[PDB]
Amino acid sequence: QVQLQESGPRLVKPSETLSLTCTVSGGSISGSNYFWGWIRQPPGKGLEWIGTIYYGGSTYYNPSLKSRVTISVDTSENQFSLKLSSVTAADTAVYYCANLAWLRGYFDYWGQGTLVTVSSASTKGPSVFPLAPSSSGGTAALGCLVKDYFPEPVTVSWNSGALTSGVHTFPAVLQSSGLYSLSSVVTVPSSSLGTQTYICNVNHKPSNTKVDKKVEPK
Amino acid sequence: EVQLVESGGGVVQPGRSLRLSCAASGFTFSSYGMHWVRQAPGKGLEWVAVIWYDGSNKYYADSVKGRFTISRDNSKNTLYLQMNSLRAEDTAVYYCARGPLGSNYFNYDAFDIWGQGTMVTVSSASTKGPSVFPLAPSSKSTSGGTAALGCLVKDYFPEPVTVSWNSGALTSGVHTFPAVLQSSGLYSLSSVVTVPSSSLGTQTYICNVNHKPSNTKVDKKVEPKS
Amino acid sequence: DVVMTQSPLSLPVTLGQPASISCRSSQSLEYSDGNTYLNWFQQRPGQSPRRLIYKVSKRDSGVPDRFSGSGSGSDFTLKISRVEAEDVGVYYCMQGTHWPLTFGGGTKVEIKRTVAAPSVFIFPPSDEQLKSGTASVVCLLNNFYPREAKVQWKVDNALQSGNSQESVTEQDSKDSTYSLSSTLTLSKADYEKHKVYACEVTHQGLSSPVTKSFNRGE
Amino acid sequence: NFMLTQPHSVSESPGKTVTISCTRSSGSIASNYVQWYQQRPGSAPTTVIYEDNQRPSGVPDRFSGSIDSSSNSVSLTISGLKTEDEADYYCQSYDSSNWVFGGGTKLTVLGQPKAAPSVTLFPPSSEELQANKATLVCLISDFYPGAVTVAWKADSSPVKAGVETTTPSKQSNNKYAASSYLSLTPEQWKSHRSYSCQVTHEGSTVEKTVAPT
Amino acid sequence: NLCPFGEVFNATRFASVYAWNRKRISNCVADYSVLYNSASFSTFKCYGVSPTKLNDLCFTNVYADSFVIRGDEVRQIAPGQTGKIADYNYKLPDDFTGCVIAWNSNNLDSKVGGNYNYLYRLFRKSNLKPFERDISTEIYQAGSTPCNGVEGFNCYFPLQSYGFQPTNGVGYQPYRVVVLSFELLHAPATVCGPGS
Ligand SMILES: *[C@@H]1O[C@H](CO)[C@@H](O)[C@H](O)[C@H]1NC(C)=O
C-alpha cells in the first residue's frame, strides 16, 4: 500500500531552477519494479506528463521539456526528484508524482500535489481602477479592477456592506508579470445610476493597503 | 481398452432425420476432441464433422454444413451426430474417431482410434423380402467334371441378406456375390457353388436365404433341367 | 480443398516382396510449427480403419516395423518391407491441419498371382421367374486372377447395353482369384421374342474372346 | 508524439446516460491501452478505467469502456448518472516513449435548468490609460453549466498573448460566472479598430466588441 | 534455464504472414517483463489476462506465432477482426487469451527498390478457421469460367507481395508481429514466470 508525497518550494523565481522530491512510504523504489513519474497541471488546465523513471536505468522525458528536465532517485532515503531548469511564468502548476506498475500501465498511486508559482515579486499592494458602467435594460453592470498585487489574499466589499445583492468578486489571475489581478462586479438598476453612489472597498492585508474607489459613469 | 461403440443407424426416408450416438470407454472422453467420418458403400472416407474437447468449436464438411449438428455430453461420455434433411448422397457407414488430446488449436494429430461404424441408408423403398429363383445346372454349366449351380435372390430392399447352402453343410467352393442396387431401389444377389457333376443325380442341393429385416426365410431346392 | 491423391488403387503385390504407395497433396503440407500432420490408415476387408503412421513417419503402437512412412513437402510414401498376407485391403492417407481435412481416395492391395483364365457358365431364367413377367440370364466368370474382364451380352447376335449388372467378389484367401456374375434382365415378353442368348468374355487368360450361349427350348 | 482530444464538457440529468469521446490525432488509438481518470477539484486524479474495458477495485460498474477504431476514438460511458459523478475526466495512453493525457472533459450532473451566459466587455478606463497600461475585462455571468471557453480577437485576427481567464466559480445565484482579461500596451490599444471577446457555452458563441474611440 | 523468447523476437528471418511460423515454448522460466516493459514494441495488448499477472502465472505451453504484415494491417491481428489478413492469412479465435505484440521493422525488412520476399494471400474460396495456415498456389477462380490452373486469364494467382520500401508511409511499412498463445490444460505446468 504505497503513499507518495511531493516536497519542495512553492515559489520559484523566473529563470531559476525548480526542484521537487517525492518521498515514498510503503514500498521500496529499488526493490519494486514500478515506474515513477512526474505529472503537472497549470491551474485551470489539463494534466501534462513530464517524465517517468525506472530504477533499472532507463528514464523517459516529455520531448517539449527534455533540455530542462532531469529526474533522479536515491535509495538511501527512498525518494525521487524533479529538477526543471530555466523556469518561466508558464511553469506555474500543481506538480504531482505518481507510480506505474508497468510501462503502458495506468498511474495508480498519486501524491496530493504541490503548487509552485513562478514570480519575482515582493509584497505589493493593489492599484484599483474603475470599471465604469455600461450594458440589458435596467441591469447596468459595474465593477472594480484590482491590479498588480503580489500577495494572493485580497478582500473586496461594496458600500462598506450595504450592497451585496448582485455582487460577485472573481478569483484572482496570475499574469505573466508575476502579479495577481482580480475584479469585482455588481449589477444594479440603470435607473439608480444617477443618484445612488457606488463605492468599492478593497482590502489587502499583507501590504497594508486599504482603498475605497468610487465608480461613476462617463 | 479404449472403445467407441456407435449406434442409431438404419433405413431413413429422404428428407427425414436421424440421430447417431457414439459411446466411448477406456479413456477420459472429456480430454480429447472427436470426429465423425463416413464411408459410402464402395467409396473412400469422407470427414463429416469435428467437435472440440470442451465442446467449444464445431466444424463441418460443406456437404453436411447446415444440415448436420455435432455435439458431445462429457458427463455421459457420448458423441452425437444429428442428421437432418437427409439426402441420398448421405447413405454411408458413419464412424466416430478420437480427435486430438487437448485443444485442436494446438494439437492436431488425431484419428488414432475408430469405432465399428453404424450403417445409415437413406431410401424411400418399402421393406420387401426376396424372391428366390433356382439357377439350375445345365450342360452349359457342367464344363468338365464340375457343375455350377446357384440361387438368384432378387427384389429385397433392406440390405443384409444371408445365404447358406444345405444348412451350412456345404461351404466348399461357394460364392455369394455382393448385392447390387437395381433401378427399382431393390437389391439383387446370386449365390452359386460348383459341385461334382456326377453328384447331381444322387445328392440334393438346397440354398437357404435369410432376410432378418422383413423376417423372411425361403429355402429353394435347385434341380437340373430335363 | 487440399486434394489428397493416392497411388493407383490396384496395387498387386508379391508376398515377401516390398511394396509402396504414393500420396501427393495439392498444396505443401508442413504446418506452422514445422510438423506435417499426415496420417496413414489401413482398412482390412469388412473392418473399420486402423491408423498405422501419424506425422508422416511415426509408427502407431502395435504396428509391425516393416511399415514405414516417409516424405516431405507435397510427396509422401507408405512403404512395407516384406508384404505379409495380413496387409491386404485399402490404405488411406490423410492431412490433419487444413480444415476440409480431406483423405486420399485409397489404394487397394491384392495378392499378385499367375494369370488364370475364367471358366464361363450360363444360366437361363427359371420357369418360376417367368411367371413374374421378368427374365434374368446369369453369366458366371469363375476363378480369374486378373480382376479386369469385359463381358458383353449379345441377344440373337445383337449387343445389349444398359440392360445388365455385373458384381465381383473379393480376392480369394486360398487361390487369389476373383469370380464375376453378369445378370441380364428382360421382360418375359421380349425374352420370348428371341432364341439365342450369349455372353462373350474377354480377358488376358483367353487368347481370343470366349462365347457361352444357349438357345431357348433346346 | 500524438494528441488525445475530448469535448470541453458534457452534461446530463441524474440517472441518465452520458458518453465521453477520446480521439487519437495520429496512430491507432487501438495500438496501446487507454485509461480514464476522474479528477475531483483539489484532488489528484483517480483511475476509473484501465486497459480500455477494466474497472479498478472500487469503481462501480456504471462506468464502462469501449473502443471504436472506425473513428480512432475510445469512449468512457456512465449510465445511471449520479450527482457524485460530477467531475473532470481525462483519458491517457502511451506510444513511442511518451505518455499522453487528453484535454479533459468537465462532466456536469444537472441540478437546475441550463442558462445562457451574460457577457459584458469593459474597455480600459481613462484612469489606467494615464498609468501607461491598458486592460480589457470580460465578465461572464449567470450561466448554469459551469463550463465556458473564451477567445480574443483584434479585428477578427485572433489574439493569443496576454490572455488569462478564471475557471468558473459559483455565484450567490447558484449559477456560475467567470472572467477573462486581455492585457495591452496603450499603443496597441489604439492601434486596432476594435477588440472582441468571444464566449462559448453549450456549443453557442456570444461575442461583445469594444472600440478604442 | 530461461525461455527462448530471444530466438523468437531476434530471429534475423521472420516469415510471410500467409506462411506464418509457430514455435512451442515449454520447460523453461519466462521473464515476460523483458517484453511488456520494452518501449520498442509499437503495440502490446494481452487479452483475457492482465500483463501484470504474466510473471506470476504458470501455463502448460506457450505458442509464439510470428509473421510480417504492413502497418495498417496490424489492427486485424486482434480477435473478432475481418479483412484481408484476418480472413485469408491469419485468424485469431474469438475466445483468444494471450498477447499480440508488434514492432516496425522498416530498418530490417525494407530494401531500396522494395523488398518483395514478403507476401500475403489476396483470394480464398472461404475464410480461414482460427490458426489455419494456407500455402496453396492454386489459381483462384474468381469467375464463372473454369480455369486450367496453368494460366492467369481472369483467374488470379493467390499470393501478392508487399512492396516494402523505406520511403513508404508508416502504414505501408513492415511490422514484425508475435502472437503469444497461452494454453492451460489439466496437466502440470511447464512455463512459469519468475514470481510464480
Ligand atoms: C532482442 O534483442 C535484444 C538486444 O538487441 C536482446 O537483449 C533480446 O533478446 C531481445 N529484446 C527483446 C525481446 O525485447
CSV table of C-alpha atoms in Angstrom, one decimal, chain E residues 6-186:
chain,number,residue,atom,x,y,z
E,6,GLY,CA,15.1,-14.1,-27.9
E,7,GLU,CA,15.1,-16.8,-30.5
E,8,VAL,CA,11.5,-15.7,-31.4
E,9,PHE,CA,11.9,-11.9,-31.3
E,10,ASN,CA,15.5,-11.6,-32.5
E,11,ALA,CA,15.3,-14.1,-35.3
E,12,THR,CA,17.1,-12.5,-38.2
E,13,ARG,CA,14.5,-14.1,-40.5
E,14,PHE,CA,10.7,-13.8,-39.9
E,15,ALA,CA,8.1,-15.5,-42.1
E,16,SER,CA,5.5,-14.2,-44.5
E,17,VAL,CA,2.1,-13.9,-43.0
E,18,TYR,CA,0.5,-16.4,-45.3
E,19,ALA,CA,3.3,-18.8,-44.2
E,20,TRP,CA,3.5,-17.6,-40.5
E,21,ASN,CA,5.6,-19.6,-38.1
E,22,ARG,CA,4.8,-21.2,-34.7
E,23,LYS,CA,7.3,-22.1,-32.0
E,24,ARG,CA,6.2,-24.1,-29.0
E,25,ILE,CA,7.8,-22.9,-25.8
E,26,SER,CA,7.9,-25.3,-22.8
E,27,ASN,CA,10.0,-26.4,-19.8
E,28,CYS,CA,11.7,-23.1,-19.0
E,29,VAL,CA,11.2,-19.9,-17.0
E,30,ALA,CA,9.8,-16.8,-18.8
E,31,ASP,CA,10.6,-13.3,-17.6
E,32,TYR,CA,7.7,-11.7,-19.6
E,33,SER,CA,8.7,-8.4,-18.1
E,34,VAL,CA,11.5,-8.2,-20.7
E,35,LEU,CA,8.7,-8.0,-23.2
E,36,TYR,CA,5.9,-5.8,-21.7
E,37,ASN,CA,8.4,-3.3,-20.3
E,38,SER,CA,10.1,-2.8,-23.6
E,39,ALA,CA,9.5,0.7,-25.0
E,40,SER,CA,10.3,-0.5,-28.6
E,41,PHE,CA,7.2,-2.5,-29.4
E,42,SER,CA,4.7,-0.4,-31.2
E,43,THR,CA,1.7,-2.4,-29.9
E,44,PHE,CA,1.3,-4.6,-26.9
E,45,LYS,CA,-2.0,-5.9,-25.6
E,46,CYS,CA,-3.0,-9.1,-23.8
E,47,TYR,CA,-6.5,-10.5,-23.9
E,48,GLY,CA,-8.1,-12.4,-21.1
E,49,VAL,CA,-5.0,-11.7,-19.0
E,50,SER,CA,-3.7,-8.5,-17.5
E,51,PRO,CA,0.1,-8.2,-18.4
E,52,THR,CA,0.9,-7.7,-14.7
E,53,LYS,CA,-0.1,-11.3,-13.9
E,54,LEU,CA,2.1,-12.9,-16.6
E,55,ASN,CA,5.2,-13.2,-14.4
E,56,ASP,CA,3.1,-14.7,-11.6
E,57,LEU,CA,1.5,-17.4,-13.8
E,58,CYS,CA,2.1,-21.0,-15.0
E,59,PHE,CA,1.0,-22.5,-18.3
E,60,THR,CA,1.2,-25.9,-19.8
E,61,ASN,CA,2.6,-24.5,-23.1
E,62,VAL,CA,3.2,-21.1,-24.8
E,63,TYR,CA,2.9,-20.8,-28.6
E,64,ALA,CA,4.7,-18.0,-30.3
E,65,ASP,CA,3.4,-17.3,-33.8
E,66,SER,CA,5.4,-14.8,-35.9
E,67,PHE,CA,5.0,-13.0,-39.2
E,68,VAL,CA,5.3,-9.7,-41.0
E,69,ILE,CA,2.4,-7.5,-42.1
E,70,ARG,CA,2.2,-3.9,-43.1
E,71,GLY,CA,1.4,-1.1,-40.7
E,72,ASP,CA,-2.3,-0.6,-41.0
E,73,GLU,CA,-3.0,-4.3,-41.1
E,74,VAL,CA,-1.9,-4.7,-37.5
E,75,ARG,CA,-5.4,-3.7,-36.4
E,76,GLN,CA,-6.5,-7.0,-37.9
E,77,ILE,CA,-4.4,-9.5,-35.8
E,78,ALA,CA,-6.7,-8.9,-32.8
E,79,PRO,CA,-9.7,-11.4,-32.4
E,80,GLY,CA,-13.1,-10.8,-34.0
E,81,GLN,CA,-11.4,-8.7,-36.8
E,82,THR,CA,-12.0,-9.1,-40.5
E,83,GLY,CA,-10.3,-8.0,-43.7
E,84,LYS,CA,-7.5,-9.4,-45.9
E,85,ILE,CA,-5.1,-10.6,-43.2
E,86,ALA,CA,-7.8,-11.9,-40.8
E,87,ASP,CA,-9.9,-13.6,-43.4
E,88,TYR,CA,-7.2,-15.2,-45.6
E,89,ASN,CA,-3.8,-15.2,-43.9
E,90,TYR,CA,-4.0,-15.4,-40.1
E,91,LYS,CA,-7.2,-15.6,-37.9
E,92,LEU,CA,-7.3,-15.4,-34.2
E,93,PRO,CA,-10.2,-17.1,-32.4
E,94,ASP,CA,-13.0,-15.3,-30.5
E,95,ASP,CA,-12.0,-17.0,-27.2
E,96,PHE,CA,-8.4,-15.9,-27.6
E,97,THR,CA,-6.3,-15.4,-24.4
E,98,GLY,CA,-2.9,-14.0,-24.9
E,99,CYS,CA,-0.9,-11.1,-26.2
E,100,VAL,CA,-0.4,-9.6,-29.6
E,101,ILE,CA,3.0,-7.8,-30.0
E,102,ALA,CA,4.1,-5.8,-32.9
E,103,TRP,CA,7.0,-3.5,-33.9
E,104,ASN,CA,8.1,-1.6,-37.0
E,105,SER,CA,10.9,-3.5,-38.9
E,106,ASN,CA,11.4,-0.9,-41.7
E,107,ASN,CA,15.2,-0.7,-40.9
E,108,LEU,CA,15.3,-4.6,-41.1
E,109,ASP,CA,12.8,-5.7,-43.7
E,110,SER,CA,12.9,-2.8,-46.3
E,111,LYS,CA,15.3,-2.5,-49.1
E,112,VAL,CA,16.0,0.3,-51.5
E,113,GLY,CA,13.9,-0.9,-54.5
E,114,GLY,CA,11.3,-2.7,-52.4
E,115,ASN,CA,11.5,-6.0,-50.6
E,116,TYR,CA,9.2,-8.4,-52.3
E,117,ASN,CA,10.0,-11.6,-50.3
E,118,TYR,CA,7.0,-10.8,-48.0
E,119,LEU,CA,3.7,-11.9,-49.4
E,120,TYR,CA,0.0,-12.1,-48.5
E,121,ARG,CA,-2.9,-14.1,-49.8
E,122,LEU,CA,-5.4,-12.0,-51.7
E,123,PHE,CA,-8.1,-14.5,-52.6
E,124,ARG,CA,-9.6,-17.6,-51.0
E,125,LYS,CA,-12.8,-19.6,-51.5
E,126,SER,CA,-13.7,-19.4,-47.8
E,127,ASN,CA,-12.3,-17.8,-44.7
E,128,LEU,CA,-9.6,-19.5,-42.5
E,129,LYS,CA,-10.6,-21.2,-39.3
E,130,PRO,CA,-8.5,-19.8,-36.4
E,131,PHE,CA,-4.8,-20.7,-36.7
E,132,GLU,CA,-5.2,-22.4,-40.0
E,133,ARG,CA,-2.3,-21.8,-42.4
E,134,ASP,CA,-2.7,-21.9,-46.2
E,135,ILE,CA,0.3,-22.1,-48.5
E,136,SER,CA,-1.5,-23.2,-51.7
E,137,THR,CA,-0.6,-21.6,-55.0
E,138,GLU,CA,-3.7,-22.8,-56.9
E,139,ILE,CA,-5.2,-20.3,-59.3
E,140,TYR,CA,-8.3,-18.7,-57.8
E,141,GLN,CA,-11.4,-18.9,-60.0
E,142,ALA,CA,-13.0,-15.5,-59.3
E,143,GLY,CA,-15.1,-16.0,-62.4
E,144,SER,CA,-17.6,-18.4,-63.9
E,145,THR,CA,-15.2,-19.8,-66.5
E,146,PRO,CA,-13.3,-22.9,-65.4
E,147,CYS,CA,-9.5,-22.3,-65.1
E,148,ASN,CA,-6.9,-24.8,-66.2
E,149,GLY,CA,-4.5,-23.6,-63.5
E,150,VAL,CA,-1.6,-23.2,-65.8
E,151,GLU,CA,-2.7,-19.8,-66.9
E,152,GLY,CA,-3.7,-16.5,-65.3
E,153,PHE,CA,-6.6,-15.2,-67.5
E,154,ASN,CA,-9.4,-13.8,-65.4
E,155,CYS,CA,-8.3,-16.3,-62.8
E,156,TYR,CA,-5.8,-14.9,-60.4
E,157,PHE,CA,-2.6,-16.0,-58.6
E,158,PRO,CA,-3.5,-16.2,-54.9
E,159,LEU,CA,-0.3,-14.6,-53.4
E,160,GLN,CA,0.5,-10.9,-53.8
E,161,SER,CA,3.6,-9.2,-52.5
E,162,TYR,CA,4.2,-6.3,-50.1
E,163,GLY,CA,6.3,-3.7,-51.9
E,164,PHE,CA,8.3,-2.8,-48.8
E,165,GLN,CA,10.3,0.4,-49.4
E,166,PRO,CA,12.0,2.6,-46.7
E,167,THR,CA,10.2,5.7,-48.0
E,168,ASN,CA,6.7,4.3,-47.7
E,169,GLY,CA,4.2,5.8,-45.3
E,170,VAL,CA,4.2,4.3,-41.9
E,171,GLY,CA,1.1,2.4,-42.9
E,172,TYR,CA,2.8,0.6,-45.7
E,173,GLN,CA,6.0,-0.3,-43.7
E,174,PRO,CA,6.9,-3.8,-42.5
E,175,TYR,CA,5.8,-4.7,-39.0
E,176,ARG,CA,7.0,-7.9,-37.3
E,177,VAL,CA,4.3,-9.4,-35.2
E,178,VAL,CA,4.5,-12.0,-32.5
E,179,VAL,CA,1.3,-13.7,-31.1
E,180,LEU,CA,1.8,-15.4,-27.7
E,181,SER,CA,-0.8,-18.1,-27.1
E,182,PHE,CA,-1.2,-19.5,-23.6
E,183,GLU,CA,-2.6,-23.0,-23.2
E,184,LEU,CA,-3.7,-24.2,-19.7
E,185,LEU,CA,-4.7,-27.8,-19.8
E,186,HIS,CA,-5.2,-30.2,-16.9
